Amino acid sequence: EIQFLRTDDEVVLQCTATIHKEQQKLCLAAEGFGNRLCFLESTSNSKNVPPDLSICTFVLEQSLSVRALQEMLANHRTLLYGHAILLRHSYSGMYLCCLSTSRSSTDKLAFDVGLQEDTTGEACWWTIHPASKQRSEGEKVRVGDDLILVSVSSERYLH
Amino acid sequence: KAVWHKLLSKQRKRAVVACFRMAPLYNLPRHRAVNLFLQGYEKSWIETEEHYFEDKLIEDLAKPGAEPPEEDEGTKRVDPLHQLILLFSRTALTEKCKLEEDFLYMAYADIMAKSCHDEEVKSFEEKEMEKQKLLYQQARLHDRGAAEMVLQTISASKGETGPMVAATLKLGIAILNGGNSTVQQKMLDYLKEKKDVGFFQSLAGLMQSCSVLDLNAFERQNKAEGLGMVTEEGSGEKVLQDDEFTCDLFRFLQLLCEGHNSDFQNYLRTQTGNNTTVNIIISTVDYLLRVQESISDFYWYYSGKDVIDEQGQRNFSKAIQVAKQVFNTLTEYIQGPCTGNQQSLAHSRLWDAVVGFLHVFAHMQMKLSQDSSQIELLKELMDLQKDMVVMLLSMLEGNVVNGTIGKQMVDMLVESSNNVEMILKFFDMFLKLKDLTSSDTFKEYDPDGKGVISKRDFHKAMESHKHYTQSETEFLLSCAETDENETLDYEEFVKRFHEPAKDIGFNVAVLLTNLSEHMPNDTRLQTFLELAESVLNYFQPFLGRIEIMGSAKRIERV
Amino acid sequence: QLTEEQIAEFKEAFSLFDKDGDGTITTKELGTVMRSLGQNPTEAELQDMINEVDADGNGTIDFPEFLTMMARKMKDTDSEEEIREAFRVFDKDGNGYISAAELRHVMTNLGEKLTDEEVDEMIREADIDGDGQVNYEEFVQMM
Amino acid sequence: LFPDENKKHGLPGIGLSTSLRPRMQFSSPSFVSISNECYQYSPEFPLDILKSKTIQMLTEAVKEGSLHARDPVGGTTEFLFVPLIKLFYTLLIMGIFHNEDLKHILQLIEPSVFKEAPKEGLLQMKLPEPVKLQMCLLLQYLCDCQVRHRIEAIVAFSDDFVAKLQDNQRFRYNEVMQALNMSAALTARKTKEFRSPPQEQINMLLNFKDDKSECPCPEEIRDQLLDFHEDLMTHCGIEKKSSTLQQLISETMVRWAQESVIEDPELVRAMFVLLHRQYDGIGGLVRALPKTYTINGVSVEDTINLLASLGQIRSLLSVRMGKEEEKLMIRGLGDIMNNKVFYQHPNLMRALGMHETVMEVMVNVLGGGESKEITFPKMVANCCRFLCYFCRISRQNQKAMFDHLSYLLENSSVGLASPAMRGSTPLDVAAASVMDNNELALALREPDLEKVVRYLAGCGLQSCQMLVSKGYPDIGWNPVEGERYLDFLRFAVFCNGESVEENANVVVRLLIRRPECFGPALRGEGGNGLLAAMEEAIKIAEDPSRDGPSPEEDDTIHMGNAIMTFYSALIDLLGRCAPEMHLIHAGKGEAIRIRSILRSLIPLGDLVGVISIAFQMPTIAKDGNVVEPDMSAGFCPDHKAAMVLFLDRVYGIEVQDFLLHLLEVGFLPDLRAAASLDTAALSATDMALALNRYLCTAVLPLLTRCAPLFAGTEHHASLIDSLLHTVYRLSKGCSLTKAQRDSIEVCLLSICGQLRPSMMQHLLRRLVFDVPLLNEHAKMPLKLLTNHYERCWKYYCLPGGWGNFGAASEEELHLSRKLFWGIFDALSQKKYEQELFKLALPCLSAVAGALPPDYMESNYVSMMEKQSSMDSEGNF
Ligand SMILES: [Ca+2]
Ligand SMILES: [Ca+2]
Ligand SMILES: [Ca+2]
């Protein structure tokens, strides 16, 4: 009845904004050649401005667990909360990552988020967490639901 | 000389450290040693001293005393046991915010529980005598209102784990042991005719409050012994806080629906009379998913390590016992083709838990078989696998051809294909071991009955047998442990491996045959069938297959 | 009552464990020695066992307290017995005289690398008797 | 156990009891006196007359009741019996009855059972339910007396059993030690008995039971216990009159229950409790033995006083909190503290459960008037002080207090804001519970840390209500509460010099999850940084309008000092939470991640700047009195101590450029300031002491562990010379304690040894003028000279010298000759001190070896050697 987000599926990570008393839907976008840094493109103004979903679509290759990530760092599937995922940018073929090289945007704690070619390292892997209290860790992720990702390398959320 | 002084110093370091370490008891003053002796004497002797008086006390307390001798000129006097149970019931029925701990109830519930059970091949006469004695001893209590009291205490518990709840659960198990129909009927009538929602709410609260394996606490304990800290408690019960409580709580729920009590089985799923309904069937499968997740995480922690330590082995044993009890409880709810519970479990989260158990069984068996020290853990794990397959076979009860439950089950097997493949390879290998050891070529290698075969002779016997591949050869050599003489006892080897394969793989063979017959046109299933041909061919002499007219007025194969 | 050279031998034995030189054995200072001998202690075990010897209660045993624990035990003849105990076990030859050839062989156990020839230069200093092969008597001269 | 050879139970109560019991004191009720001591204690009464009349009246009541007269005394059987039996029970509890009186009054209860080798006792009289309950109470007391007699007999047996066991262990140990050697005795399984803790030794010795029989104790000693245990079992009843109180009670309770349907729930409860006690006599010992303690004869009086104080405190539970009750309980707690048994016997202290009584007395006060603020604040302080001292007494007390950690941290905010209350808050009790116990720190859980993290977040978010009510400026945060919540986290994460990584990872993760706990400066949005925060705090400290409330002095929380202490505590906590060095060498991802997170949170430049901040030196006034800068308000060396700890544990000093830059910017000025305050008058100043403590505990060991980095510093010539001169001046300083002097000696010996030979010429030109004095201060210079002249022997002897270093300039040779001659003369004309002579001889020999035998001194002498500028008078 209800679908479930599984591997090898193309999705867009969309975030909402409440700037100046209105709900604004924004999508995470990045383009391979040129600037590797990720930016946000408006999607609520689709009637006025056509969004560029080409740089917004991402592919979910693996949904391995944290222990599997630890083992492969030492060296077709349904996503479950608390697992490490590998988002691949469809257009560029470069995986999302925490660049760990901040641009010094006021808050010194945060780092920059972009695309990196190499798959090795813990920067590319991201752990999904259930925003909804009804959802639980280990439970399968619904297609329509809220997520809060955590960077393995930096222990920071996509903010 | 100076170098010699340094050389001498190295051993002199040991002397000073040794005398510092020296703490003989005689140096202690008299009072300190006397106090330590009092504590040691207490623990070693007074606590360990045991005497059996529960049956005597209950029999004396249940006797109506001299009623014809002294005339009350009133209502029939209640026996002292009846008065005690009535007091305990009234205390529970009294409205209080919390269930206060009471020593009298704690002691007397234990006494009554011991009285009920009062505990090589027993004959039929002795078995029937024991059943009659158990029935009479349980009647001695449920004729005075213990079945109602054990429900009232659980209701007043308000879903809070405590020794009071543990004693109540033990008493309930004692009175329900063997599937007491009269006690089941009394409990069900009580619950129905006073519409108790607190009982089910407290049951749900307790089942949420039940604990599982904790890698964090176990790793903290590991760091403790690694630093060298002595175990204050030998149990180390920070991991798996209350295994006894969890097992007792689930055994209570299993004995409640034993004997296929369709009425109580349905009433657990849906309390029709009550205003609010709680799904114990779904709560149980939720706890099963929690415990299987904990077990999988513990296995993942022990994946890299070559050998399992004793602490990990005992934690695995306790978790396996808990999971086995939960699986038995789920089986008893889906026994007696109870369609409602079958559908509920089919739509519930049982499938991914079984998938997880399948991976654990596939890898844990491979890991344990090589090492010869923890064969008991392997046996417990395979017993858990047997109970899981029994649960699946009960799930398939009353299934028509091309049934939806069977279809979901084949999807589960397809999802867990590789683990099923490895389990089937394991069983096929250790069942063909018997044909290998019965081959006459091996008897020609070892003509006399001493049975002391050499490693190389066994290796070339396997090649002469030719049925095994090189990978199978290496794996059997690894799983075969021999002394430095390379002298191995194939007799103990086969008695240690084949019979367990024989009596667990039968359930897998039966499940696969059932699925194959009830789905004659499922393409994916013939892959597992052709992978398990050898197991099926071995178990063909032992598999009895008949058809009967089932309770659903339809022909069923048994 | 303690014999004068025994305290002097207790002086050096005290300094053998008092690396810092202040005359106070801290728990960590004592602890590193016990790891060096192979045993792995907990901090509580070390601090528990150090309390019994500490009569003052300062947490660090001084030499006057150290003497009392030394007086607790019978080192009546254990000193030279251990000296002979080493001479017996260092006598791999068993001739009653210990050769210099295995002198380098046991000092390597601690990790020293002093050359083969130079030790028999030092054993010659030990061999004021001139034996050319060290006995217990030379060991007594050494100690 | 048994009065005579035949195993017959003695009459309950009758016997010799030696267990300590509360003292009986009474006061005469006289109203003509003008004294007030009589108000203490209960009024006197004729106890013997009351006892005799009670016995007579009970006898008459029993003899008359059996005939069932129409008119009893008072009109009813209940009125006749209940008050009289209540008075009898009270007298029996007080213990007035003795010997024949007890015999008669027990015969009045049951003639057949208690007759000593017709009329029916009280137990067969068809009594009402209140009378039955009052008789159940009497039977319970008799059973308790039997249990006490059993416990006393067990303690009697233990006296000689333990003595003979100890003698046997001495004999066995002597035989084993004759067999083996002390050095080899550390190993070998035979010595495991003696190396085991005493509790484990007794556990192994008491293996007589069953068939295993692996205990080393012989059969002659085994038989005594294998007889006493069965005697105790027989006395407990584990193996025609009933002849036993146990059987009498067991029959009576069941007979009553089957005779009548009891309506009163209390009677049913009492009867079944008593029946279970009769049928579970082993449980009585199982419960009593853990509460049984043994004391020597000398400690009896002090134990009695401690028990009286405990009784007073326990009895004050039943009365409501108030002025006089607070005074009484505070005085009693002080009495318990002053008692020596409180220290000598902590096991008895815990068995009596005084800590639970203090738990209850604190809970009552804390729960009383939560909205109207915690009334009786001195009481909470005294209770918390008693509890912290209880934790400090013994390790097991910390375990006992760890069980109430959830409540204490839930009430952690009772009195943190109020000053002068340090060590008297529930947070302090929690810190003492989880202080320096590695097992307890490991057992500490995550939600417990989360509670403290939330409290710290609130205190960093909003201001202090009490401070802004007293009139302090309303800054946007509360540093006073934070400096305590951070100290608790420090004690939780850091234990015994090592860092508990499991707790450190949780604390760091929660602190970065909620970043407002870091203070407004380090919050990250428009934050001026740690260095600017310290500068602003210094300025607000000099400003009196913002430092104080400006509407006592100890109550005055200087806002600048509070801010500075908060930031220092946060930095110290983070540095302690930093992963250990060996784990970074191993390369664990978690440790690397934590280290990187801490580096991101705190920059290097901020730490360097805060270290570069200078103090305010004390100065002498015209009159001749030193003016003392205030330490409740100002920049303190303890603040920089945490900065250096963070620098060492997080960033690490591994490069010589950074080492020298830090030495120039922050460390050397402090050394010079100490070397200037080392004057005679300024030495006793709080500044000299605090600065010396900070130096010798943080800076000097850091430079000692970073000693090898000083190898290739040829192009920094003047910096190392200044460092050596300042360190030597600090060593020559007088106010230093022994540990400080040792630290200075070790650091100077390491740095000088690692240093190049040519650089220490300026140190030699001061050492040659000081060493010949050969005073007590000259111990360290002799060793330094020995090590230097041994290491750099080729530099002086060989004409080429060290190939890279070179050779002497002949001025070093002249200085070495003067040193040699001065040392030789001073040793010649000074009195023999063995230590001085054992240290000076190697130095003299090393100098003689270093000096070439063909040495040519030059007709060069030096011009106006600046000896006066280094002489002690004025120090310049
Ligand atoms: Ca001392
Ligand atoms: Ca030799
Ligand atoms: Ca010789």
Numbering used by the authors:
A (entry chain C): 10 to 84, 110 to 193
B (entry chain B): 3584 to 3702, 3710 to 4148
C (entry chain J): 4 to 146
D (entry chain B): 1738 to 1854, 1889 to 2010, 2053 to 2364, 2377 to 2701
What does the paper say about this structure?
Dysregulation of Ca2+ handling, characterized by aberrant SR Ca2+ leak, is a pivotal pathophysiological mechanism in a spectrum of cardiac disorders, including heart failure (HF), atrial fibrillation, catecholaminergic polymorphic ventricular tachycardia (CPVT), and other arrhythmogenic disorders.
Here, we used 40 µM because this is the concentration at which ryanodine binding and lipid bilayer experiments result in maximum open probability, preventing RyR2 from reaching the closed or inactivated states. Addition of the RyR2 accessory protein CaM to RyR2-R420W + Ca2+ had multiple stabilizing effects, first by reducing the open probability (61% of the particles in the primed state and 39% of the particles in the open state compared to 27% and 73% of RyR2-R420W + Ca2+, respectively), second by moving the cytoplasmic shell upwards-inwards, both in the primed and open states, and third by stabilizing the BSol2 domain, as seen by the cryo-EM maps. Our improved sample preparation and increased resolution allowed us to clearly detect the anchoring residues W3587, L3590, V3599 and F3603 in the CaM hydrophobic pockets, and to identify the inhibitory mechanism of Ca2+-CaM binding to RyR2.
